[PDB]
């Protein structure tokens, strides 16, 4: 079973756990990121070393006169159910926030997951890319209105109405799930916190059939974002199988985007979450 597997991984000061994590290090990394490296796109990446692969990047519709107008730092990611179950992205920049909302619109996104604060330890990690109040705003040609904001202990849930300017009756409801307690150092203090957050989000995702991919982001869109997605996938497997494959999930993530589950600590945390679920049952 899982508990015995994890016991063996943790034996000898996590020796086999480390070895397994290190086996994933080169996965996916021979893939080109030439589009992301075009000079015209340079300002559109938050981090030089976190770029989407050409094979898996999300494309925006082209705006005439600008061939590089298709670019956003964003990647498609598989889950248990669909090949493009998620779109992962960086925390938007002031200059990419209209692109972000354009992607949300064009990809039929109904659910957005944000696993960061805008500022952490005095560093800007993500722009405040959504409305501050209930007054509506255009991001490019898209109209956005916050209908509700619910500040809970460990997350904030917001509802937005989005529509194109030239068709006001064809609007969409979008939910935004903002995990607000990820600590400045390490991983969350409890497994309970991220497990409950993931299950909360999943229960909303299951009630949005016909939606496009779920957007997940943090600052770079790799570590916390990858941990969120891996956890979502493995908790579904547990509920269904119950046959958990944490290694396989992280491997598949790495094929789609660099650094997904970016630290060994996050990889350990995934194993702890699953153990804790099983212990509670
Ligand atoms: Cl290049
Ligand atoms: Cl699939
Ligand atoms: Cl798909
Ligand atoms: Na692609």
Q: Which domains does the chain have, with CATH numbers?
A: 1-281 (3.90.190.10)
State both tokens at 3.
Answer: 């508990």
- The ligand with the least distance to the CA atom of 76 is 4
Beta-bridged to residue 257, according to DSSP, are: none
Q: Resolution in A for the shown PDB structure?
A: 2.1
Q: Identify whether the C-beta of residue 151 lies closer than 8 Å to the C-beta of residue 117.
A: no
State both tokens at 25.
Answer: 């290090």
Ligand 3 centroid to 76 CA: how many Å? 9
Residue 276: its H or E element:
helix 264-279
Could you tell me how many residues make up the chain?
Answer: 281
140 in a known ligand binding site? no
State both tokens at 152.
Answer: 């809970």
Active site residues: 218
Q: Identify whether the C-beta of residue 226 lies closer than 8 Å to the C-beta of residue 261.
A: yes
221 in a known ligand binding site? yes
| Whether the bond into 55 is cis, omega within 30 of 0 | no
Solved using: X-ray
State both tokens at 4.
Answer: 């015995």
Measure the CA angle with vertex 87, ends 132 and 60; round to 5°.
Answer: 80
Helices (H) and strands (E) in the chain, counts: 6, 11
């Amino acid at each position: 079973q899982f508990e015995g597997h994890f016991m063996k991984l943790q034996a000898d000061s996590n020796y086999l756990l480390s070895k397994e994590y290190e086996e994933l290090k080169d996965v996916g990394r021979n893939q080109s990121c030439d589009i992301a490296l075009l000079p015209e796109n340079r300002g559109k990446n938050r981090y030089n070393n976190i770029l989407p692969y050409d094979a898996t990047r999300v494309k925006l519709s082209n705006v005439d006169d600008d061939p590089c107008s298709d670019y956003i730092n964003a990647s498609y990611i598989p889950g248990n159910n669909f090949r493009r179950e998620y779109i992962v992205t960086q925390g938007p920049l002031p200059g990419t926030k209209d692109d972000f909302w354009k992607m949300v619109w064009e990809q039929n996104v109904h659910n957005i997951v944000m696993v960061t604060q805008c500022v952490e330890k005095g560093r800007v990690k993500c722009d405040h890319y959504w409305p501050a109040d209930q007054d509506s705003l255009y991001y490019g040609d898209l109209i956005l209105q916050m209908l509700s904001e619910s500040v809970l202990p460990e997350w904030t849930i917001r509802e937005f109405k989005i529509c194109g300017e030239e068709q006001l009756d064809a609007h969409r409801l979008i939910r935004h799930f903002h995990y607000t307690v990820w600590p400045d150092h390490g991983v969350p203090e409890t497994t309970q916190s991220l497990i409950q957050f993931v299950r909360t989000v999943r229960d909303y995702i299951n009630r949005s059939p016909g939606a496009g991919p779920t957007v997940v982001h943090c600052s770079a869109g790799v570590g916390r974002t990858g941990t969120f997605i891996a956890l979502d996938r493995i908790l579904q497997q547990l509920d269904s199988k119950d046959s958990v494959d944490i290694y396989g999930a992280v491997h598949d993530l790495r094929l789609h985007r660099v650094h997904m589950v970016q630290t060994e600590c996050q990889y350990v945390y995934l194993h702890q979450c699953v153990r804790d679920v099983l212990r509670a049952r």
